């Protein structure tokens, strides 16, 4: 086991300056608070002397606000001198209450130290492949050479022929300013039709369903977890996954902790403790969490098959609609009451690849989802025992005939589900259908990724569907392609192919620039515009590490993260908050907004010189010198109630910030929304939710069922509590990688001995996209013939085993994959030292 | 002295609620206690050994209730509160004294 | 000055121990709360003639909360927010929110078999300095 | 303590110093010999009007042969094995056996024009705590 053997901290001291910071990592977006000092001072342990006023030569107790761990702290630059730094949960901030993740815990030690050798991996300096390897050059010559480059290549083939993989979450590797600056790059200055998102292979919404309905994903607070009847959480294993939402708003909830607040704010109606339908056909350690504090009696894990969540959502729909337990005023003041034709190629299809989902009244929905309770038992594998008591947990009134309360809460088990479209649609209908929008205790919502921080120009050009970029790139299409802060090698779909030609497409741009001279930089320019011309790819990767898909790259450029700059994002209640710089960027990196400004003033020079004049004036408007300038061009000019928010007015309203959108500013205060949709008046032309007339029609993407049907194991796919996202900052971080050095598949115990595997054994995954390997994990919770491999990760990428398949919105169906297993070698000496017991807490 | 069974309670005060709303956590509400009986609160899930232990008919006067907060485990063997106990017997009175009140 | 000076501190004697029964335990002073345990098997840190005592703090890292030991999995368990540790593997975070594994004691079994703690590996949660 | 414990000392008054003549100087204690220097040039942790005067360690880090200055060059000197720090460039050695670049001091500028220095950011020669 990793042990740190630091056996004492440095004091942050009573003068010690403070800064707010979010949470760099997940939804939930935790308030946080960097205290940094001189190096050669230090905090006392009598009160007049440390940040607390508390006397530290006596042991602290549970949930001491007067602690840090080690994680919490470590040495960094600001204003180009090493500060002591700690960076500590907010017990005052509402969200988390001074909880922090074992992610955001580590924010500190996963910062950049000369001084404690922390992230030397960090990018310090632009790169280009030139004498036959990676090379460290300056901006001026790294961006010229982009610039020339795509210029050229835009010039002769179009815009079309630019391909582009970029962010558009907030947090760090995110946030308004550099998805303004990049959006700004590629949509104002440029058409960029050929873009995809860092989780998704086409410029797409993950939830056009709900949005299409007229109701936002983002419309409830985290308040409403604990004002709730039940909660309804459909693929989010949220314990792991939006750690501090689940433990500081829905336990108190499960608990009863939250009745005091329930009768004070909702009198006049029956509230027992909080009860939980958990929709994942895995028992997951949030399962577990759930029957602990509110006992099984509360707690319905509706272990449904593989992606027939649809099924299930339709037989509550039908079930819920034949008892009218529905909100009729609601259904007629709120929902859309004219009738409309079916599609033709409906049921199977939609109107078009557009729209496969038909929009329609309460009635027209229901008749369209009809579903029995015997045939959704059939598909879904459930008892109608279950579904007729999930139906009762989410429909049948309280005691005075009072409407049950339920929040509706979804993640990526839906979301990388079967039929996205439809699934969602089903889901909204029973939140809609009752009256569970824009009231306390309620919402159908995204319970979240990434915080959000997205400000872009119109994407109308992009199209719906968008571009399958990946489809593109694996077809010999597109000349130069530009990275920002993802990588397809560890996290696209059908990964293995993927990765197969990227290679050989940049091997071709490589071998040319390698082979021509770079001090004659036209000469270079022209080589690499051959290499593209017989089917080359010249990659550009804008990052913070050396990523996998930057081994492919000709030129790196390093970002800035949050905290070496000023950040802006909001969490899964829309609370935007500033993370106000602490510290400084490694070396010459730069935050993504600026090297967009950067990157366009250079596109200006080299377009003029080669004599267009035009072409080059639509670079202008990025004199940005700051990420606040950045702020200010995209957030407060284009954001919903934008004018009302800038960095010193978000700077003094601390973690807590405000709900988005602002509504005004009165005394130092921005007033926000605590709720979406509380007039019932939802995000459509006329106010209208529409229904979804939203048929199961089986697993809808290609070539998926017949992968069920020809593979022995379902390869389910997700997070691990302890990795963040593709172990970009983990891979350097020997606590996380002590405890997986291998990504693990989940594998029932019996599956197992079956299949001559032991605890650590290193296993081949393959099926008809590729091939991966992970540490085979015994899991007693597991059911036979389903295994769980942890997603996107350096040592092991379950991506390879994913299908190209989609839906017709290019939705990448990433939870539904089928594929065999085979031993590769024995468990490796280095997985001896792993514990392989449950991760199941037991009373 | 009450004054500095408040100081003692800080070791409860993560399990135990005490006061104006104190609603059940990791452990029940503590409000009244002297003369109220064991596995006593409504809401709580109490274990298959403090619930055989209010079969049987017991309170908590002030000298059952000294020998759960000095060893709770093996003195009420498979309760859900392992925990070490508050050794010092002078601040298992003091958080009684605290206690005393609510 | 530059390390933290530990106490060579007495806790227990190896006849104290039932195996797979904590000894409830205070080092390296009153207020740090943890446990010697006899493991019937030989892991990492383990001392005595079968190299399976080991000692812990038992204050989760997280939040402080109070651990509990399962005899059956031998883990253990925070109530607090449902981290688990092994005490069989160092006391590796199995699941948790922790960011730091158990922290274990440095033991040393004299002649007469007295068990001694000589250090800690990682920060007792609630001080600043493992020595206060 | 966690960090060492550093004295606020008085070493001299901005109006002491000639443009590229060192004064002798001693900190954190009379034993280490430092020199402050005013280079008439804004430079790496230099304090003053002109933000040119800088305090170093003047015992070479390598095996402590005290170090000559040459005006000419504005360099530090060690005639043990003739390693080069550049006092313009924070102490970084030009050339040199040590491995580590000078020693410098925190220095603070009051408002009567005294100079403090709080701190020293490299192990000075000859001590195993820059505070004995
Ligand atoms: N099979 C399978 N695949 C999946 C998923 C799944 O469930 N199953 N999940 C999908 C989802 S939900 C997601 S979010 C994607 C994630 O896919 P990726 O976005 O590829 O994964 P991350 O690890 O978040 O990648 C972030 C990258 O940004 C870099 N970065 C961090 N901060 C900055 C910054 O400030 N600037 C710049 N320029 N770069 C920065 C990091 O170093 C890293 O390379 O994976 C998807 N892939
Ligand atoms: N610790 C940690 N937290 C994170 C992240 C991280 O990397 N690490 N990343 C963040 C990001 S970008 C995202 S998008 C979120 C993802 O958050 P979640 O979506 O909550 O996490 P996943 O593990 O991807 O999948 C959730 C659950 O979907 C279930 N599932 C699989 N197939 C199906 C299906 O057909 N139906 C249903 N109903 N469920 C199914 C899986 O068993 C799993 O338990 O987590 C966020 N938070
Ligand atoms: C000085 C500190 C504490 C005091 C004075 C205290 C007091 C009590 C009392 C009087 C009871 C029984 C009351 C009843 O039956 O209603 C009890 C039960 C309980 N306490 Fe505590 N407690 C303390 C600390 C803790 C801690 C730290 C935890 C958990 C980590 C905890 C968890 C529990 C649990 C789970 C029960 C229920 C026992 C069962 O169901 O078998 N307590 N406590
Ligand atoms: S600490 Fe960070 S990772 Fe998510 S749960 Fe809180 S935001
Ligand atoms: S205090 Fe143990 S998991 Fe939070
Ligand atoms: S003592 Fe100065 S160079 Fe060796
Ligand atoms: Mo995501
Ligand atoms: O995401």
């Known amino acids: 086991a990793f042990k740190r053997h630091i056996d004492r901290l440095p004091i942050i001291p009573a003068d010690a300056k403070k800064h707010n910071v979010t949470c760099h990592f997940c939804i939930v977006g935790c308030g946080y608070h960097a205290y940094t000092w001189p190096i050669n001072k230090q905090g006392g342990t009598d009160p007049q002397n440390n940040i607390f006023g508390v006397d530290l030569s006596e042991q602290q107790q549970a949930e001491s606000d007067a602690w840090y761990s080690p994680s919490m702290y470590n040495v960094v630059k600001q204003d180009g001198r090493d500060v002591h730094v700690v960076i500590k949960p907010d017990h005052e901030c509402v969200v988390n209450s001074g909880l922090g993740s074992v992610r955001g815990a580590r924010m500190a030690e996963t910062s950049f130290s000369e001084a404690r050798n922390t992230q030397q991996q960090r990018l310090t300096d632009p790169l280009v492949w030139r004498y036959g390897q990676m090379q460290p050059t300056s901006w001026d010559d790294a961006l010229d050479l982009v610039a020339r480059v795509t210029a050229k290549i835009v010039k002769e083939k179009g815009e079309d022929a630019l391909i582009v993989s970029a962010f558009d979450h907030g947090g760090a590797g995110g946030g308004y300013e550099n998805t303004w600056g990049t959006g700004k790059l590629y949509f104002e200055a440029m058409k960029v039709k050929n873009i995809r998102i860092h989780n998704r292979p086409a410029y797409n919404s993950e939830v056009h369903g709900t949005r299409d309905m007229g109701v936002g994903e983002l419309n409830n607070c985290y308040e409403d977890a604990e004002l709730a009847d039940t909660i309804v959480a459909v693929g989010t294993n949220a314990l792991e996954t939006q750690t501090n939402y689940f433990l500081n708003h829905w336990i108190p909830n499960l608990r009863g902790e939250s009745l005091g607040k329930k009768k004070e704010l909702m009198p006049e109606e029956p509230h027992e403790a909080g009860r939980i339908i958990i929709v994942d056909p895995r028992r997951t350690v949030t399962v577990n969490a759930c029957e602990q504090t509110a006992g099984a009696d509360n707690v319905l894990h509706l272990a449904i098959n593989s992606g027939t969540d649809l099924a299930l959502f339709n037989a509550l729909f039908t079930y819920i609609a034949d008892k009218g337990w529905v909100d009729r005023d609601f259904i007629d003041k709120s929902t859309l009451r004219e009738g409309t034709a079916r599609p033709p190629l409906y049921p199977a299809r939609g109107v078009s690849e557009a729209n496969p989902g038909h929009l329609s009244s309460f009635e027209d929905a229901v008749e369209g989802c009809r579903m029995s309770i015997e045939e959704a038992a059939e598909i879904t594998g459930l008892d109608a025992a279950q579904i007729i008591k999930a139906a009762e947990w989410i429909g049948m009134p309280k005691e005075g005939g009072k409407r049950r309360r339920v929040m509706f809460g979804y993640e990526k088990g839906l979301i990388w589900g079967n039929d996205n479209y439809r699934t969602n649609g089903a889901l909204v209908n029973l939140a809609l259908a009752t009256g569970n929008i824009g009231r306390p205790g309620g919402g159908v919502v995204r319970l979240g990724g990434h915080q959000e921080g997205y400000v872009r120009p119109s994407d109308a050009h992009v199209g719906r569907p968008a571009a399958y970029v990946d489809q593109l790139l694996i077809g010999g299409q597109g000349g130069v392609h530009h990275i920002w802060g993802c990588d397809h090698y560890k996290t696209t779909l059908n990964a293995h192919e993927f990765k197969r030609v990227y290679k050989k497409r940049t091997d071709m741009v490589k071998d040319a620039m390698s082979a021509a001279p770079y001090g004659d930089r036209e000469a270079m320019v022209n080589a690499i515009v051959d290499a593209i011309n017989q089917g080359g790819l010249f990659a550009v990767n804008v990052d913070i590490i050396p990523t996998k898909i930057g081994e492919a790259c000709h030129v790196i450029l390093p970002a800035a993260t949050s905290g070496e700059m000023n950040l802006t994002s909001m969490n899964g209640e829309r609370r935007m908050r500033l993370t106000e710089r602490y510290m400084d960027p490694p070396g010459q990196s730069m935050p993504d907004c600026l090297i967009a400004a950067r990157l366009a003033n250079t596109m200006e020079r080299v377009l003029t010189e080669m004599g267009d004049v035009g072409y080059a004036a639509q670079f202008k408007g990025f004199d940005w010198q700051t990420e606040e300038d950045a702020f200010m061009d995209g957030y407060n000019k284009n954001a919903h109630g934008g004018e009302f928010v800038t960095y010193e007015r978000l700077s003094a309203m601390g973690t807590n910030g405000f709900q988005e959108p602002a509504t005004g500013f009165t005394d130092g205060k921005i007033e926000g929304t605590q709720r979406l949709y509380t007039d019932g008046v939802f995000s459509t032309d006329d106010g209208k939710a529409r229904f979804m007339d939203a048929p199961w029609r089986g697993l809808q993407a290609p070539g998926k069922q017949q992968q069920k049907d020809s593979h022995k194991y379902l390869i389910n796919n997700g997070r691990a509590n302890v990795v963040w996202q593709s172990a970009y900052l983990d891979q350097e971080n020997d606590f996380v990688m002590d405890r997986f050095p291998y990504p693990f598949i989940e594998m029932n115990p019996e599956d197992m001995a079956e299949a001559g595997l032991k605890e650590g054994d290193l296993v081949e995954i393959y099926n008809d996209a590729g091939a991966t390997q992970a540490m085979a994990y015994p899991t007693p919770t597991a059911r036979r013939g389903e295994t769980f491999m942890l997603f996107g990760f350096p040592t092991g990428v379950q991506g390879n085993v994913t299908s190209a398949g989609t839906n017709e919105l290019i939705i990448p169906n990433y939870k539904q994959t089928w594929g065999n297993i085979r031993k590769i070698s024995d468990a490796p000496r280095n997985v001896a030292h792993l514990s392989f017991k449950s991760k199941e807490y037991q009373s | ?102 | 000055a530059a390390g933290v000076e530990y106490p060579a501190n007495r806790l227990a004697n190896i006849s104290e121990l039932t195996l797979n029964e904590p000894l409830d335990v205070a080092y390296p002073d009153e207020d740090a709360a943890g446990v010697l345990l006899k493991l019937g098997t030989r892991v990492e840190g383990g001392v005595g003639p079968d190299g399976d005592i080991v000692g812990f703090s038992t204050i989760c890292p997280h939040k402080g909360f109070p651990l509990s030991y399962s005899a059956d999995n031998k883990t253990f368990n925070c109530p607090g927010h449902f981290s688990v540790f092994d005490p069989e593997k160092g006391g590796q975070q199995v699941w948790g929110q922790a960011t730091q594994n158990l922290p274990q004691y440095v033991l040393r079994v004299a002649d007469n078999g007295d068990i001694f703690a000589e250090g800690v590996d990682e920060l007792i949660y609630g001080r600043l300095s493992n020595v206060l």
Do not use: Q
């Open chain 2, 1 to 102: 002295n009450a004054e500095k069974g408040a100081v003692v309670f800080k070791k409860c005060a993560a399990c135990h609620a005490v006061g104006d709303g104190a609603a059940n956590k990791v452990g029940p509400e503590l409000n009244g206690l002297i003369g109220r009986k064991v596995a006593g609160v409504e809401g709580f899930n109490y274990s298959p050994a403090f619930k055989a232990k209010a079969e049987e008919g017991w309170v908590w006067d002030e000298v059952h209730l000294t020998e759960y907060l000095a060893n709770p485990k093996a003195y009420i063997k498979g309760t859900k509160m392992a925990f070490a106990g508050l050794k010092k017997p002078e601040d298992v009175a003091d958080v009684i004294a605290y206690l005393k009140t609510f």
